[PDB]
Each structure stands twice: as structure tokens, then as C-alpha cells.
């Protein structure tokens, strides 16, 4: 509720406004362990729960019930993430799940289909991912068509900012939780493909943690 006390060096640096934006943190691949980092840079992040499911466990009296929650976050302009958490009571699960969703926000790469006319709208390449017997593939699509996908993964693609794509699924897609994790891995690998336009060598610079001096 009230103003937060930094625990890490990065937290102190953000508090002093010594770092510009998230893209250098992404460039240097630094771990994030505190959810106030994301919302200090990115307001208006929409969150939306998929469903809540009970889980059992046998005990002397009977069966012990816990509740599992599915939560994803996104800004519809290139940032998306999800979190999974179970707890003994539903309400705790939703708030705690939101924290992991904020902690797992990643950037996406958006490309062109054919000719370029500003505001990239589709995937740069075709990418796919697998998580335990579920495979989801994304294909670039021409401008104008809508999203052709299941209702579950259409929301994730809508919140990721991708405008045109083709989708195909294989394996046992009945596991909704696994399906979302497979789509998230496929989107996570968009920046992992080396297109020919990235062949130019880049210059390495020292990280903000190294070249800044933290407060006591």
C-alpha cells in the first residue's frame, strides 16, 4: 500500500531513476524478482483470469481441496506474461497469481508479410513450441484477415499485440493450462530467430549495474 523499501541494487537504481527503460534490462538479460519494477515502467497492464480448478488430496477424513488459478497479463503492444498459482483459498490465489504474471512479462518481435508499410502487424517468421504432448505453431499472415485460432489462445494473442497470424495445434490440446504454456514458449522464441537483417556486428557496452554506484 504505502511506499516500498528497496531490497536489491536494481530496486534502488529504479528508485533513484538511474535507468532509462526496460529495453536495456532486456538487452543485458538481467533477472527480475520484484513486481514493482514492471508497473513502475508499464502502467495500464490488463489482467484476466481464465478459470479456477479444484485439486484433491486424500486424508483420513476425506479429500482436501485446493484451488488453482490461471492468470495472464499484457499490454496489447508487445508485452505479455502469465502466472500459475494454487492456494487453499481462491482469493489468495488470484492476487498471488497476478504477481507471477507480472514477473514473467517478456517482449515480442513483430514482423511483416510481404511489403512493409509501417506498423508491423504479423510474425517475422513461422515459430512453434511444444510442452508435454501439446504443440502450437504460428505462421505469418497477410494484412486484413483476423486471428484464426481457438478462443483460449486468441485472447493470449490479442493481449500480446499480434494482429495477423495463422495457428495450428497438435497433440492433446484438452489441457488448457499446458496449451497456454506452449503458446507462451512459441511467442517467447520470436526474438530467438536470426534473420539476415541482423548480421551487422554490434558494440558491447558496460551494464548499468557495473558502471553505476548504488546507495548505502
Amino acid at each position: 500500500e504505502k511506499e516500498w523499501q528497496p531490497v536489491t541494487k536494481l530496486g534502488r537504481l529504479v528508485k533513484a531513476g538511474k535507468i532509462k527503460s526496460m529495453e536495456e534490462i532486456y538487452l543485458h538479460s538481467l533477472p527480475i524478482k520484484e513486481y514493482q519494477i514492471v508497473d513502475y515502467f508499464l502502467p495500464k497492464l490488463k489482467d484476466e483470469v481464465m478459470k479456477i480448478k479444484p485439486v484433491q488430496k486424500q486424508t483420513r477424513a476425506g479429500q482436501r481441496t485446493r484451488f488453482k488459478a490461471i492468470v495472464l497479463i499484457g499490454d496489447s503492444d508487445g508485452h505479455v506474461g502469465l502466472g500459475i498459482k494454487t492456494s487453499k483459498e481462491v482469493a489468495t490465489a488470484i492476487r498471488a497469481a497476478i504477481i507471477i504474471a507480472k514477473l514473467s512479462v517478456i517482449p515480442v518481435r513483430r514482423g511483416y508479410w510481404g511489403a512493409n508499410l509501417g506498423r508491423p502487424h504479423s510474425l517475422p517468421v513461422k515459430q512453434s513450441g511444444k510442452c508435454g504432448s501439446v504443440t502450437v505453431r504460428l505462421i505469418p499472415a497477410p494484412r486484413g484477415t483476423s486471428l484464426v485460432a481457438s478462443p483460449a489462445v486468441k485472447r493470449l494473442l490479442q493481449l500480446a499485440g499480434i494482429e495477423d497470424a495463422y495457428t495450428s495445434s497438435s497433440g492433446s490440446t484438452k489441457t488448457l493450462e499446458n496449451t497456454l504454456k506452449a503458446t507462451f514458449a512459441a511467442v517467447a522464441n520470436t526474438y530467438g530467430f536470426l534473420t539476415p537483417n541482423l548480421w551487422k556486428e554490434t558494440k558491447l557496452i558496460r551494464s548499468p549495474l557495473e558502471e553505476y554506484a548504488d546507495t548505502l
Binding site: 490488463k46 484476466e48 483470469v49 479444484p54 484451488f67 481462491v90 482469493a91 488470484i94 485472447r155
Partner: peptide
């Protein structure tokens, strides 16, 4: 019970929100 809690909470944005009659 899980369905009951989701409507009861009235603090989160669900995928589909029913409108009474």
C-alpha cells in the same frame, strides 16, 4: 463452489460475465 467464488468476488475481470436476465 469454484463457480460460486468467481461471481462472488466481484473484484476481477472474467472472460465472460453473465448479465442478469
Amino acid at each position: 463452489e469454484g463457480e460460486a467464488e468467481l461471481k462472488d468476488e466481484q473484484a476481477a475481470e472474467e472472460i465472460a460475465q453473465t448479465e442478469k436476465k
